[PDB]
Design a protein around this ligand. Structure first.
Ligand SMILES: [Cl-]
Ligand SMILES: [Cl-]
Ligand SMILES: [Cl-]
Length: 130
């Protein structure tokens, strides 16, 4: 599914994302907008390294989830990558929390550095009741 902005924002707040390891809700919103345009079924194959990025946060199969088809991969989220293609994003959120427990935090996503870091991301949550 393709979330609407404010419904997403409340969905993520319910799932404990606001201020998770120091990360405001707006940053997560910015990350989701730029990774997938709020589309849980979004995928991107990386021909270069044989990995795939899954779902609304575009979580990569090499490190985080299992798809069976990525060399030398580990599954730190302990999930099938299919869990990251669901309408219900709880599993994707749990995995995203796990990504940011590692030592880069949100910096693990390059789209966040490009499109979010040291920018004014207030607009993402404006009007949403969060
Ligand atoms: Cl911030
Ligand atoms: Cl699973
Ligand atoms: Cl679902």
């Amino acid at each position: 599914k393709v979330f609407e902005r404010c419904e997403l924002a409340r969905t993520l707040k319910r799932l404990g994302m606001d201020g998770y390891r120091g990360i405001s809700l707006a940053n997560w919103m910015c990350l989701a907008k730029w990774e997938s345009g709020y589309n849980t079924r979004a995928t991107n194959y990386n021909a270069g390294d044989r990995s795939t990025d899954y779902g609304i946060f575009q979580i990569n199969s090499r490190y985080w989830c299992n798809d069976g088809k990525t060399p030398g991969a580990v599954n730190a989220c302990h999930l099938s990558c299919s869990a990251l293609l669901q309408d219900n994003i709880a599993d994707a959120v749990a995995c995203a929390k796990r990504v940011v427990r590692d030592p880069q935090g949100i910096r693990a996503w390059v789209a966040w550095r490009n499109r979010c870091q040291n920018r004014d991301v207030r607009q993402y949550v404006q009007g949403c009741g969060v």
